[PDB]
């Protein structure tokens, strides 16, 4: 009813199939058919969502207009999500005045004053770490990366939001981690094609979230807030803040706490992972960041936050592992208005998206994109980079609101890591990585690392 | 566009509103609206659940015609139930022609011979039970049953199914043990009212059982099948009859592994925490049967098979309590046929309804109905009983396939621990118990006891 639209305008794509859209093209993974999308068609191209359209776009400028410029005005939500049952008033769900209301409310939990605040904090479990790599590095035994780095990133997300002090990896049974370690699935591509059935679950307060960790964390969370009320972390700054322009909700308070412990987890973990396999597969990079980081922190010395930003090598390094897998992959905005930008119309509804994946592998703005060299990222040549054609925070004011926590999360974590340990591969060790054909941006085949002790 | 059927047939019945039914009136339970509804409306009475017509029979005879006379012929299948998935092949689900051909593969396995051949095994966990309790008993520390119940009926079932041996109470968070713990609650209640939206969840594979702990066993089987294979329990039998009238395939052999597992985990665990209630709230009751038990066992003598059976005043008191809470509540079964039975015609597709919980507490057959009194079910008096009035595992060929298990597990575990323990109140136990308004047979507050070690 609606798979003539891009017939229309002119703009190129892949032919729909009626009902499916454009989905079957999915089987190679979103990354490899955006790639072949943006070989195929060029600057600009459309597909179908189901009975959905999405528009691709290309530009510096045009996206410049819908992440930042007329953010406000016409791209100011993602693509509908659902079911969800009560995490609707969720930051990265919410939409229009309900987002500005909560990006406000939220966004002095990132400044550099509290993230320093917080530098104590995040250092203690960078220790707790290598304790767990030492037990499996005296006891060769190759290592997975995603197990200790997601209980360290669970361990410093705990810490960093509600106190609770957990050696998950040892404690991977406490009552509070379990809970915690919980889109080309069979369920998701049902969403996709039956976008009307999504109102039935909502009304039946079925929602993709289990009904069961949400409910043993509006308590959980409860139990605390009545605990330190009254007797640094993300939730004494939550509640500090309900102490535009109403105040905080507590079934609003709950909603955002969940948003913010996945976002830290699986993706704390997962790209300290592809940055540990870059090393092991590039060990000429891991001299040279060895090198700086001991020349910064001599006799292994403790990182601070004015130490962080002061490693260049560290921050190239990580820069160009981000641009390899950009764990986003894309970035989304719906268009609530009949608009024309940079020359071209854009009717209402439709789904604007920038694949940034593919967007990190062009040609056109990366010598050699499929190469690891983090000296694209040196000072030097740092200049003739786009900053909208590499978004693995996005951009504008909808853009990663914890960005500078992650950065500082992560790079506490590879100091205090490669100071003592060192990381060569396998013969088990896939190399070189095949990404998942799947839904997420993670590996086909889990990361394993033998692991040694400097 | 059905709620006019009972109007017509001249059968009485609450005023059905559109839509809802008579649903409104669960809000105090199946069983206090069955009480209700026997007392107002006499010996047969009608309701709808949302647009499903429900038909109430008190009568021995016509009970008798619908549960084991016309069963094959009539009355085959239970209220249709989902969604499931897979789990279309379980027995207790299964329908007809792939009931009868599931319902004789596997009554083998509740023979006297095999039940008797479970005896050294059963009695094993037994012992692992009193240490649990003792432990707790030394330490004066009020008890749950359910909880150290529930770890023993769950160590039975494992055993008797898979041979997985595991002190479940002691390790709540062995990886077999987690994913095991696991009508009127905001879900199954849009479900009655949303017959038809049934097969969108069914198309989804969205199951009200979580996609994620049946993968989890079907692999789990999957290990042991073939670690036994080539190298006493459930499957061992399960196996060796796949050895009407084609063989047991795999995706069926793993569906009824699951239902047994529920089937012996929270009833088994239910009703003996019903028992030790009568018992700590009628302690003469238990004086007289501690001394029948030594009377058999002396010496704290281990029961035997033979011995089990032997016990008369343990099968009194374990028949009392199921009157009192007969875990099933209802017996149903779907009419296939225009038939008339015992004088009555019964349009097809009429679901037929036992209210065993009312019919357990009828005062015209029963004297004094909610009091405790074994002594209905001495030799005695147990002769003017009517077998179709008192049904706690049904009747008929549809009846509880694991009826003699159900007697054989719970009196080896009364035995072993009443030679031990004796049990008595708390100031915070619940006297007297209140019955969930919800939806299951449990109580409102969980049952909790002093216990003290002879
Ligand atoms: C390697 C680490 C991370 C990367 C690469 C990353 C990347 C991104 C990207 C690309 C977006 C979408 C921006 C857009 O649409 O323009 C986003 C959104 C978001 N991120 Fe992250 N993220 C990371 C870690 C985190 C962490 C640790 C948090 C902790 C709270 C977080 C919280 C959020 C939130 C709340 C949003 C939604 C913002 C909004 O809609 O206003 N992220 N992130
Ligand atoms: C206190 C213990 C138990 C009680 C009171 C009980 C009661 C019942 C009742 C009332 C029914 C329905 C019968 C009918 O519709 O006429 C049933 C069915 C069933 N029970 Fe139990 N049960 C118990 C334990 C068990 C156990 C330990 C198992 C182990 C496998 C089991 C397996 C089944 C199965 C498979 C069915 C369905 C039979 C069929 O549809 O063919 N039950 N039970
Ligand atoms: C794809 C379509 C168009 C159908 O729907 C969307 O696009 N929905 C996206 C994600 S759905 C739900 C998600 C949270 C979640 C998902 C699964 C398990 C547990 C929690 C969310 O609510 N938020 C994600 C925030 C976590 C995060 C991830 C990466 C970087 N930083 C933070 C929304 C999204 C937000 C931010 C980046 C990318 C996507
Ligand atoms: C009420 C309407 C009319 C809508 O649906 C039905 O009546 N569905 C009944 C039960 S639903 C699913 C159930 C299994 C199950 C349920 C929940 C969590 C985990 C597993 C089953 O599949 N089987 C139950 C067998 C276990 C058992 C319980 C008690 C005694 N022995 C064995 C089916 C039923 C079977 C047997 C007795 C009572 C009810």
Redesign the interface.
Known sequence: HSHGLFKKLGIPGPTPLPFLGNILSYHKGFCMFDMECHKKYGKVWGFYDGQQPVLAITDPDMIKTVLVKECYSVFTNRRPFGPVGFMKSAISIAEDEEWKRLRSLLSPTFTSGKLKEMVPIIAQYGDVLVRNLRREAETGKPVTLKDVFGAYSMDVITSTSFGVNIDSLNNP?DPFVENTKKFLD??FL?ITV?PF?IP?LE????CVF?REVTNFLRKSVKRMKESRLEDVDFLQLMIDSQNSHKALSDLELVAQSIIFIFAGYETTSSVLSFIMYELATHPDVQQKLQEEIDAVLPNKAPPTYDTVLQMEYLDMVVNETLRLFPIAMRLERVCKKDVEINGMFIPKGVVVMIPSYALHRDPKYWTEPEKFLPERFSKKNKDNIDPYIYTPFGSGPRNCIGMRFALMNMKLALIRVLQNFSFKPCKETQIPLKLSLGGLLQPEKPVVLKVESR
């Open positions: 049974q069979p369920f049902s039956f059935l039935i009304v039946l307060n079925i289990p």
